[PDB]
C-alpha cells in the first residue's frame, strides 16, 4: 500500500566539510566512550567476558580495520542523512567551504505546539525504523515480524 521513493546513498558525494563533521563525531564518541570506561572501572582481560566485564576499548581507533569501523561509521547519521533527503529544510547556518547550574527545564510549562510536532518526527522516525527493518526482513527470507505495534 506504501510505496516511499528509495532515496540514493552511496550515488551522492561527501562534501569534505561533512567528512570532517563525521570524524569530529567519532572523536566525540571516543572521549565519552573511554570517559564512562574509566570512571566505571572497566578491568582488562584475556577475552571478552560478559560476568566479568572486561571490554577492551581504551585504545586509539585510528589503527582498527575497515571492518570494525564501518558498522559504527553512522549510528546516528544514518537518521541525519534521511531527514535533509526526505526533508528539505537544510538550515543556513555556517558559510560553506567556576560551574554554572544547569538550566531548569521541567519548571517551565511545554507549549502546546511544542509537543504537537514533538510526536510528528517520532512517528515519522519509528515509520523509518519500520520501514528499513521490515524490507530487509523480507530481504533475508522474512520470518517473525514482531514490531506489528
Known amino acids: ?3 516511499p521513493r528509495p532515496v540514493e546513498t552511496l550515488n551522492v558525494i561527501i562534501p569534505e566539510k561533512l567528512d570532517s ?3 569530529k563525531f567519532a ?3 571516543h572521549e565519552k566512550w573511554a570517559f564512562d570506561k574509566i ?3 572497566w578491568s582488562y582481560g584475556e577475552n571478552v567476558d560478559e560476568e566479568l566485564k572486561t571490554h577492551p576499548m581504551l585504545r586509539p581507533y585510528k589503527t582498527f580495520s575497515e571492518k570494525d569501523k564501518e ?3 553512522w549510528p546516528i547519521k544514518e537518521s ?5 533527503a526526505w526533508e528539505w529544510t537544510i538550515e543556513k547556518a555556517r558559510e ?6 544547569p538550566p531548569d527545564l521541567s519548571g517551565v510549562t511545554l507549549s502546546r505546539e511544542l509537543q504537537a510536532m514533538a510526536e510528528q518526527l517520532a512517528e515519522n522516525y519509528h515509520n523509518t525504523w519500520g520501514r528499513k527493518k521490515k524490507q530487509e526482513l523480507e530481504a533475508k527470507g522474512g520470518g517473525t515480524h514482531p514490531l506489528l505495534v
Open 1 to 3: 500500500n506504501f510505496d
Open 21 to 23: 563533521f563525521i570524524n
Open 27 to 29: 572523536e566525540y564518541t
Open 39 to 41: 570512571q566505571n572501572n
Open 71 to 73: 558498522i559504527y561509521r
Open 80 to 84: 541525519l542523512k534521511a531527514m535533509i
Open 96 to 101: 560553506g567551504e567556576y560551574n554554572p547550574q
